Design a protein around this ligand. Structure first.
Ligand SMILES: *[C@H](O)[C@H](C[C@@H]1CCNC1=O)NC(=O)[C@H](CC(C)C)NC(=O)OCC(C)(C)Oc1ccc(Cl)cc1
Ligand SMILES: *[C@H](O)[C@H](C[C@@H]1CCNC1=O)NC(=O)[C@H](CC(C)C)NC(=O)OCC(C)(C)Oc1ccc(Cl)cc1
Lengths: 299, 299
């Protein structure tokens, strides 16, 4: 059982380079529009406290250099939507996949295609944390890299990368430019509050452990939803609900282990630790696989 | 710092479906040749102890059904090379990337494009273990999935998937059909011997930890190559060598931490454990990032 990303090919063909002045980052080219973070228009002396409206007023279509491979695209319009720019170009991307824009929920997962200079460097899987950050791997030049899911042949874009927080975690927007969480695109100290553990995902991963033969942490106790949650709260775990219980249905069925039984084993792990043992090769409790991810992978 | 795979698009366009009888698995379509595991010709009653030469003698070109999307390809020749079949087809793949076949060394890493029915399902990063197994995620139908590295625009194929061992780890071949390790493609119990930890990779990951601000495990001791290795052997770690020390050069330089100093910290971690703390978000010592991987990711 592995952290598995979606195949990235459909997204690779949408990545372009966008330069304004000496600032370069990545853009996403779908039909005749290129989407990118609006801070492409900032100089380093603007990033402390930009007035983006005023900055963009000094920019014309020809100040945006958009490059797809060795091919410069012609910008024929521009507008700002929340924290993203939309650059209308004179060529529709011939590689545009079937796609939609979605705003994901916290606790859900997606794949990131990390890019530099409009060129893909690598792919990995991320969760939107309950505090609306992601634990990514991003350097200078990575902004405009996107996160996505694939359903059949349709790419659902859900994330565009903008910034790193002082804790080393990452923040960004949906493809309409609205940040996940309370963040703003300016280079000031910003707090993500307390993060919490995605309880239903830990359970899904414990189920995945059982499916893959790892069963040592199972005990002979059970518990109640309200009793467990009294333990969840203690550990900054999200409360569990019947919808969670139901979502776990397929896994609880494949394994014959009641969700509340699995909860009792989780309580003991939270209380007693793992005694130097491992679960699916990890010595910590993993919360960045959804139930769907586990079903998808073990099917 | 994340387990990061290569972008998979160039490989996605090489995957096809190969059926012989009711056995279906994946093939790799490059120029006018499709490569796949030879056990595609086995029935379930053949897999216990196949005579592949005899089995293949009863097969003709038209018994191999090769499908790329909705498109059946015409097989015009077939031959067996070690544990792979080469099916000559009448159409050269128009999506063939620049490519080579390489036999990787143990301790090196690569990306796996896990496929079913010739369709990519997901991508993840693997190391060739010192005992020539990989810790993958593979189900029935995944054989013929490949592992690769990308250098610039050139895909270096290094692995084709064939089998799971009783321990749950995975074995397969290079693209000439020669198994990594002592394995044979028959459904009998086979041992991978003792695995060992890839010492230079653990050090590279400790360097990656330091680069990313995690420094608690550093101590004020140093050691000798021979003294450390007396500790390495104790823990089934690979011995460290000057070539390893030199390969770590760039990281030792970026950090100002002598390799033998980092070795002394590693010795203490092996001896004293991690006292419930974490390094790059892991509570175990990670050995599936090479020095190159760490340089690539932190650059
Ligand atoms: C866009 O490519 C870049 C991505 C971050 C750089 C470091 N790791 C990232 O994910 N985003 C920014 O630089 C962003 C622009 C603001 C206008 C929102 N600033 C930001 O993320 O500040 C946090 C710090 C740690 C200061 O990030 C860095 C900024 C500049 C440099 Cl040279 C290094 C880090
Ligand atoms: C090829 O798609 C398949 C891949 C393994 C299936 C289970 N996980 C794998 O990686 N390879 C085989 O089935 C292989 C064929 C032999 C001719 C070499 N047999 C094999 O791997 O045996 C090990 C076991 C655990 C028996 O694998 C399974 C075989 C069949 C089935 Cl239905 C389930 C598991």
């Amino acid at each position: 059982f592995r952290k598995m990303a979606f195949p990235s090919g459909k997204v690779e063909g949408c990545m372009v380079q966008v330069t304004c002045g000496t600032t370069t980052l990545n853009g996403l080219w779908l039909d005749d529009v290129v989407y990118c973070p609006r801070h492409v228009i900032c100089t380093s002396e603007d990033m402390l406290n930009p007035n983006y409206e005023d900055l963009l007023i000094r920019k014309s279509n020809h100040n945006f250099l958009v490059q797809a491979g060795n091919v410069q695209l012609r910008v024929i319009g521009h507008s700002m939507q929340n924290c993203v720019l939309k650059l209308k170009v004179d060529t529709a991307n011939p590689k545009t996949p079937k796609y939609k824009f979605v705003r994901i929920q916290p606790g859900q997962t997606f794949s990131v295609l990390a890019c530099y200079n409009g060129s893909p460097s690598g792919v990995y899987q991320c969760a939107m944390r309950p505090n609306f950050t992601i634990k990514g791997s991003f350097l200078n030049g990575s902004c405009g890299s996107v996160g996505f899911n694939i359903d059949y042949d349709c790419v659902s874009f859900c994330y565009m990368h903008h910034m790193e927080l002082p804790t080393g975690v990452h923040a960004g927007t949906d493809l309409e430019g609205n940040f996940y969480g309370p963040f703003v695109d300016r280079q000031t100290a910003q707090a993500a509050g307390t993060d919490t553990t995605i309880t239903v995902n830990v359970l899904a991963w414990l189920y995945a452990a059982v499916i893959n033969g790892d069963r040592w942490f199972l005990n002979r106790f059970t518990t109640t939803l309200n009793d467990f949650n009294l333990v969840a709260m203690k550990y900054n775990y999200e409360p569990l609900t019947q919808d969670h219980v139901d979502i776990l249905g397929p896994l609880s069925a494949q394994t014959g282990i009641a969700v509340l039984d699995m909860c009792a084993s989780l309580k003991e792990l939270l209380q007693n630790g793992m005694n130097g043992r491992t679960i699916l090769g990890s010595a910590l409790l993993e919360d960045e696989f959804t139930p769907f991810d586990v079903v998808r992978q073990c099917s």
